[PDB]
Amino acid sequence: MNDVFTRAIAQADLKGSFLLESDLDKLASFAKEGVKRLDAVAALTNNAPAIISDAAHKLFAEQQELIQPGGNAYPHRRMAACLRDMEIILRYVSYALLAGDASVLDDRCLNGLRETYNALGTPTQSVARAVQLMKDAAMVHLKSTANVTVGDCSSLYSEAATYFDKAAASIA
C-alpha cells in the first residue's frame, strides 16, 4: 500500500542509502503542489454521482444490449452490480490520485478483476468503456473552477488520465 513518498523510500532502502538530493527536491515540489491535488480529489469525491450517472447513460445508450434481457446488466441486481463496480473503480482512482501512486488501484482493486469478469461471463470491453466514460466525465468535472483559485493543473489531469487508462488496460 504505497504512495509516492513511500515508493521513494522503498527504492532508497533497496539501494541501502539515504534519500538523494534530487529525490527530496521532487518530493518537496510534490508536497507543495499537493494542495491542488487535494482539490482534484475533492472534485472527484463530491461529484461521483454525476460521473457515474453520465457514464452509465452514455454506456447503455451506446450498447443497449446490456439492458436487453439476457444482457449482462439486465436485472436490477446486475444493474446495481454495474453501478457499484463503476463507483468502486472511481473510488480507487481518487485514492490513487490522492496518493499520487497507482499501487492502491493496481493491488487492492485490479489484481484479479479481469479474471473475475471472465469467470462471470461479463464483457470486460463494456467495463473498459464504462471506465473511459467515467474518465471523460471526471475530466469535465476536474476542469470546473468554481469556488477555487485558478491555476494550472495539467499534472493532475495527466495523472487522472493515466490512472483511468491503467484501469482500463488492466481490465482489458
Binding site: 500500500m1 439476457g70 487492492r108 489484481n111 473475475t116 469467470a119 462471470l120 461471463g121
Partner: protein
C-alpha cells in the same frame, strides 16, 4: 482449544498462540503487533474468545495482511477460511458479503462472520476456530471441501501478503463456473450473432 471460566495462566498463552496461528494464518505476528489490552480484557473474562477474535479481526494487523494488498473476493475467501474454518459455497455468500461491506463498512462485514449462527454453534463463545471443512459439514456443496483444500496449502505454508504473487485469489476460479455458467450455451449463440454482424 477452549478457555473455561476458571482458567489459569497455563495454556492461556497456548490459547493465544492457537488464536494467532488460526486467525492470521501461519504468518508471523511480532509482539510489536499483539494487542496486550485485548489479552488482558480476555484474562478476566470481560470478553469471550469470540470477542477477542472480533478485536483481532478489527486490528490493523489483520487488515494489513488480508484487506489492503488483496481484492475483495480474496478478502471474503480468507475471512471464511480463518474466522469460520470453511471455504465459501457460492457467489450468494460473496455477493452478500461484498454488498454488506460496501454498504455498512468493514465492521459490519466482520460481524457477519463473528456473530453468525454458524459461528455460534460450531465454535461459540469459548472455542478457537479450526479448519473444519475437511470433515463433512452438514449442508455443504462438494466444493466446500475442495475449496478448503485449495486454500490450505499445508501445515508449513500460510496465506501471507508479502510474497511474489501478491496474494492473488485462489478460489474465485474454483467457485466461478457453477454460479454463473449455466447460461453459457445461449450466450454462445448471442456471441456468434454479434460476431457475424
Amino acid at each position: 482449544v477452549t478457555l473455561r471460566a476458571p482458567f489459569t495462566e497455563e495454556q492461556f498463552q497456548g490459547a493465544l498462540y492457537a488464536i494467532y496461528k488460526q486467525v492470521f494464518g501461519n504468518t508471523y505476528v511480532m509482539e510489536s503487533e499483539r494487542p496486550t489490552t485485548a489479552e488482558s480484557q480476555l484474562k478476566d473474562g470481560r470478553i469471550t474468545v469470540r470477542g477477542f477474535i472480533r478485536l483481532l479481526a478489527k486490528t490493523e494487523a489483520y487488515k494489513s495482511r488480508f484487506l489492503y494488498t488483496t481484492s475483495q473476493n480474496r478478502f471474503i475467501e480468507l475471512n471464511h477460511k480463518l474466522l469460520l474454518g470453511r471455504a465459501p459455497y457460492d457467489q450468494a455468500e460473496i455477493i452478500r458479503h461484498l454488498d454488506l461491506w460496501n454498504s455498512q463498512g468493514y465492521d459490519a462485514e466482520i460481524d457477519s462472520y463473528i456473530e453468525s449462527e454458524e459461528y455460534q454453534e460450531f465454535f461459540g463463545e469459548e472455542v478457537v476456530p479450526f479448519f473444519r471443512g475437511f470433515k463433512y459439514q452438514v449442508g455443504q456443496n462438494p466444493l466446500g471441501f475442495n475449496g478448503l483444500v485449495r486454500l490450505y496449502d499445508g501445515y508449513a505454508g500460510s496465506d501471507t501478503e508479502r510474497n511474489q504473487s501478491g496474494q492473488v485469489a485462489r478460489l474465485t476460479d474454483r467457485l466461478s463456473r457453477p454460479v454463473r455458467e449455466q447460461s453459457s450455451v445461449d450466450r454462445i449463440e448471442r456471441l456468434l450473432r454479434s460476431y457475424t454482424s
